[PDB]
């Protein structure tokens, strides 16, 4: 039945079945299963057909469900947007009449308006599309007609306000990407030329109308208009006063009027100072009446309704905007000082609301104020600076707010890896981390303004924690975060005294408190605070040693979270105070590093493997600070002894019998050892080479064998075997091997030694093993690893680039050539490797068989045709860099041009005119611009048409024109000629080139027929000529 219904709907030789369409749409909106998808497909196919609109009227004459009416209106809107320029003028007039009549009829009936608002909105949008197509050339009296119709009736006035709001939105807010530059400018000029009547109507309705819905709609339309209208209509009329007096205080107009006032305040001009001062004064006067300063805004928001919460948010937005814009203007008026303070009070009140976004707005204002005051004079409490003198009464309130609501410094997330490993990870730059950073910057500025007040606030908070009045884990955590955030904001002596007092009080609190949980919380807070003040620990060796020994003691504590906190604090201190563990400290016989290494076995006996890896990384940070080469080597040897024992035992077992490598426990041990090695390499850096040199070959022997096993497994039970724990462990071992190699190579400062020693073993252990592996078993990281090596070696690995390709290139291409989806990681890493080779080893490309170079170019073209954004961007970057490199080498430049220039241009134009590849438009333009400049300067000294030795520029003009005409037959010859002339003229102005490309992209989606009026060929040609003249002048200069 469904297929027959679809065929009947798509069969335009028979009358449409309205009942069938209603049933199909009802199934779509209330279906269950494949029926809904089939209905979607049928409706999409019916809409696609060019003759669908021939039935739309019939639908609107017989449809009962509003969904079908919406579908018909969608078809009509598509027709108007696309083919309005090729329809007969009689059909256009008929559509105009039908749309206007339907709008009027539906808006006339209040019951119909209430029942269906989506229908009314769709009809208004269709009308706005018609206006964009025709007005004002074919509808010069639309504005006056709608103004008169609105003045006659109130419902018609409301509908006309909605229509005008939509028109303003479509002409000024969402024009880019839907209207060409010339037509957009024409529409904007037309809208601005006839705005006096619209503004007069809006003022009349606001001042006289008593119909609340109509006033609300007018206010929304005015809010939309404020984005673009000339300033005279705002700052030279009764608009601000009318909004503040007649609507701001009204409960049902407060939100929209406040939004309008915020938009007005956001404006920044140097000739309407009096108007801005009046706006601020009157708004403050109204707010004091509708929102008393004694109100608890936090509780009001918590128990407030949606309107109340929105009003509080809009009030915060308005205050922040106006203050950040005209604080200096308001400050200059002495009589307004109190008012200004009141404004600040309001901010503080809103700062107590338990809402993240409102607090973010308030904190943005607070950060701006603190930064301005700090820039005025960074010194602490000479005469106080003027602005600081003005703001002194509430800076302590801001400090209290900052200390009382400090955000968590770091975010920790437990994530399951690809292989099923549970890993703790630190988020780098998220919303919450940004919030903490802003709060910390504000508090640091305030502390720099004066540290006594901040210290007093912190001491009071700590006292209240101690005495139990304000005791809680949350409050203690917040106070300790606030204490840590201000590290480095005060002098060393004041910092030392304050920190000694704080630590003494915290230790006393820990002593007094009872229970394991409270003691753990307080101890964790103490460790966090001491870890945030590295200068304090560096100054006092006894305190540093005590802290480190306490951390080692905590590392044996099985209470939840204590071991992780101890390891994190230990690594933080080791990173910050690394230089104090290698030297001999007063009162010590040997450096603390030797003491730690001697007892490393007893320290980590209780740690979990991830904590052990963190501990090893911290110790490696300490080791890397040893400047002496011999002592550093001895420390490294003594440092890897425990992992090396297990490594050697496993290697001997494997040599005796390779089957041991199939034992899961051995694989877990190997993975742990390699993770430890990776962390140690990251911490130590280049001098870690020796450790790598000790295991490298053996590692490569464990890798390859394991790899083979994986492949065999896949050949025995298919890809599903990859889900088994043993294969996951083997893949973990392989990936850790690759990670260790990549990390050391990246951190190694010796390309020659790397190329001589560590690459040749790779060529056979990993690359050829990668080639021999089945496609399912190939490890993508291999490719990425190689990329890193290339990025570090460049000219030192060029000779080996051919061989590397013979191992990875072809076998990889056949994996990512059948579609754009399968093996995403392989595509990403392969094209990253190709980018590295192109950027650092271009002579490798210049010294390979021409067939191989053609394959590489085809791979790049396949790259920038990808739906994946990263792959396409990498392909475009590769292409641009390749073009630059080819231009650099004169010998092969002409050959490369004559072989690939036209093909690359054709592919670039194919992607450019595709809607799916708009995200890379910038790059597209750049490439195209460069190419055309290359063809216009004369760099290509050989004609691209050997049969016809014609000028390169003329030949390229004709070639591109013909290519575009064939691709888009519906385009006009003048359109294509202008587009090509702009391509050849705007090649030295990338923003203009991109705008030209966007104009062409919007043009090719509309059937302009033979109408040349909307093309504005004269204005576009004048603009292109001006750009050409400017570029020529720049060239002459």
């Amino acid at each position: 039945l469904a297929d027959h219904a679809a065929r009947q709907l798509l069969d335009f030789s028979q009358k449409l079945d309205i009942n069938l369409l209603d049933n199909v749409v009802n199934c779509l909106y209330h279906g269950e299963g494949a029926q809904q998808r089939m209905a979607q497909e049928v409706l999409t196919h019916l809409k696609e057909h060019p003759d669908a609109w021939t039935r739309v009227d019939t639908i609107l004459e017989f449809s009962q469900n509003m969904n079908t009416k919406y579908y018909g209106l969608q078809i009509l809107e598509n027709v108007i947007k696309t083919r309005w320029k090729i329809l007969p003028r009689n059909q256009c007039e008929g559509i105009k009449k039908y749309v206007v009549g339907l709008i009027i009829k539906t808006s006339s009936d209040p019951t119909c308006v209430e029942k269906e608002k989506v229908y009314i909105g769709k009809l208004n949008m269709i009308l706005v599309q018609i206006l964009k197509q025709e007005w004002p050339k074919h509808w010069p009296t639309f504005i006056s007609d709608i103004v008169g119709a609105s003045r006659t009736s109130e419902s018609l006035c409301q509908n006309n306000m909605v229509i005008l709001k939509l028109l303003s939105e479509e002409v000024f807010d969402f024009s880019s990407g839907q209207i060409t530059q010339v037509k957009s400018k024409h529409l904007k000029d037309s809208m601005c030329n006839e705005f006096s009547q619209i503004f007069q109507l809006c003022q009349f309705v606001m001042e006289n109308s008593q119909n609340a819905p109509l006033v609300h709609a007018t206010l929304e339309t005015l809010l939309r208009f404020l984005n673009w209208i000339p300033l005279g209509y705002i700052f030279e009329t009764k608009l601000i006063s009318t909004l503040i007096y007649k609507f701001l205080n009204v409960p049902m107009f407060r939100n929209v009027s406040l939004k309008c006032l915020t938009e007005i305040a956001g404006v920044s001009v140097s000739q309407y100072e009096e108007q801005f001062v009046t706006l601020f004064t009157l708004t403050m006067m109204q707010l004091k009446q509708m929102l008393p300063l004694n109100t608890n805004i936090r509780l009001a928001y918590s128990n407030g309704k949606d309107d109340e919460q929105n009003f509080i948010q809009n009030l915060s937005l308005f205050l922040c905007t106006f203050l950040k814009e005209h604080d200096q203007l308001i400050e200059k008026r002495l009589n307004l000082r109190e008012t200004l303070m009141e404004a600040l009070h309001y901010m503080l009140l809103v700062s107590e609301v338990e809402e993240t976004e409102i607090f973010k707005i308030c904190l943005e204002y607070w950060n701006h104020l603190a930064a301005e005051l700090y820039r005025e004079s960074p010194f602490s409490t000479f005469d106080v600076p003027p602005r600081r003198q003005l703001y002194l009464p509430m800076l302590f309130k801001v400090r209290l707010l900052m200390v009382s609501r400090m955000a968590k410094p770091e975010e920790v997330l437990v994530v399951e890896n690809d292989q099923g490993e549970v890993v703790r990870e630190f988020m780098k730059d998220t919303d919450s981390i940004n919030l903490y950073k802003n709060m910390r910057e504000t508090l640091v500025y305030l502390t720099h303004l004066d540290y006594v007040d901040t210290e007093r606030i912190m001491t009071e908070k700590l006292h209240n924690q101690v005495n139990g009045t304000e005791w809680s884990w949350k409050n203690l955590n917040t106070l300790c975060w606030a204490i840590g955030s201000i590290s480095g904001a005060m002098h060393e002596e004041d910092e030392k005294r304050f920190l000694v007092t704080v630590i003494k009080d915290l230790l006393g609190l820990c002593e007094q408190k009872r229970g394991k949980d409270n003691k753990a919380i307080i101890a964790s807070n103490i460790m966090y605070i001491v870890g945030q003040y590295p200068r304090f620990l560096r100054a006092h060796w006894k305190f540093l040693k005590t802290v480190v020994n306490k951390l080692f003691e905590f590392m044996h504590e099985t209470h939840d979270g204590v071991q992780d906190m101890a390891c994190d604090t230990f690594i933080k201190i080791a990173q910050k105070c690394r230089r104090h563990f290698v030297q001999v400290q007063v009162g010590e016989v040997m450096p603390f590093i030797d003491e730690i290494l001697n007892n490393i076995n007893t320290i980590i006996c209780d740690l979990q493997p991830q904590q052990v890896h963190t501990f090893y990384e911290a110790v490696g940070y300490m080791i890397g600070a040893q400047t002496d080469q011999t002592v550093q080597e001895h420390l490294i040897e003594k440092y890897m002894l425990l992992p090396n024992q297990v490594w050697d035992s496993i290697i001997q077992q494997a040599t005796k019998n390779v089957d041991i490598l199939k034992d899961p426990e051995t694989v877990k041990q190997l993975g742990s050892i390699l993770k430890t090695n990776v962390r140690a390499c990251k911490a130590v850096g280049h001098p870690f080479v020796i450790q790598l040199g000790r295991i490298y070959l053996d590692m490569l022997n464990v890798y390859k064998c394991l790899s083979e096993n994986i492949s065999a497994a896949i050949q025995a039970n298919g890809e599903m075997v990859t889900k088994q724990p043993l294969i996951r462990s083997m893949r973990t071992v392989k990936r850790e091997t690759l990670k260790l190699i990549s990390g050391w190579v990246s951190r190694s400062n010796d390309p020659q030694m790397v190329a001589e020693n560590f690459v040749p073993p790779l060529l056979d252990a990993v690359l050829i093993d990668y080639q021999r592996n089945v496609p399912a078993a190939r490890e993508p990281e291999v490719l990425s690893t190689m990329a890193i090596i290339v990025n570090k070696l460049g000219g030192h690995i060029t000779a080996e680039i051919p061989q590397i390709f013979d191992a990875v290139f072809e076998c990889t291409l056949n994996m990512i050539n059948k579609d754009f989806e399968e093996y995403p990681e392989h595509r990403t890493n392969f094209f990253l490797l190709l980018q590295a080779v192109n950027s650092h080893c271009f002579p490798a490309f210049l010294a390979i068989p021409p067939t191989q170079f053609k394959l590489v170019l085809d791979s790049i073209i396949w790259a920038f045709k990808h739906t994946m954004r990263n792959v396409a961007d990498t392909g475009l970057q590769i292409l641009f860099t390749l073009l630059q490199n080819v231009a650099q080498e004169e010998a092969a430049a002409q050959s490369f041009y004559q072989t690939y220039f036209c093909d690359i241009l054709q592919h670039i134009f194919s992607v450019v005119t595709d809607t799916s590849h708009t995200a890379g438009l910038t790059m597209h333009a750049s490439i195209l611009a460069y190419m055309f400049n290359l063809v216009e300067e004369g760099k290509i000294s050989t004609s691209l048409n050997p049969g016809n030795p014609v000028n390169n520029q003329i030949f390229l003009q004709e070639y591109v024109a013909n290519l575009l005409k064939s691709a888009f037959p519906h385009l006009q010859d003048a359109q294509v000629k202008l587009f090509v002339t702009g391509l050849f003229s705007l090649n030295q102005d990338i923003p203009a080139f991109k705008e030209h490309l966007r104009d062409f992209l919007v043009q090719i989606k509309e059937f302009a027929g033979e109408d040349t009026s909307d093309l504005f060929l004269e204005e576009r040609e004048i603009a292109l000529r001006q750009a050409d003249e400017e570029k020529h002048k720049r060239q002459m200069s």
């Binding site: 807010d173 601005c192 209208i229 300033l231």
Partner: peptide, 6 residues
Amino acid sequence: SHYRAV
């Protein structure tokens, strides 16, 4: 005067 760029 003239409209303002958004």
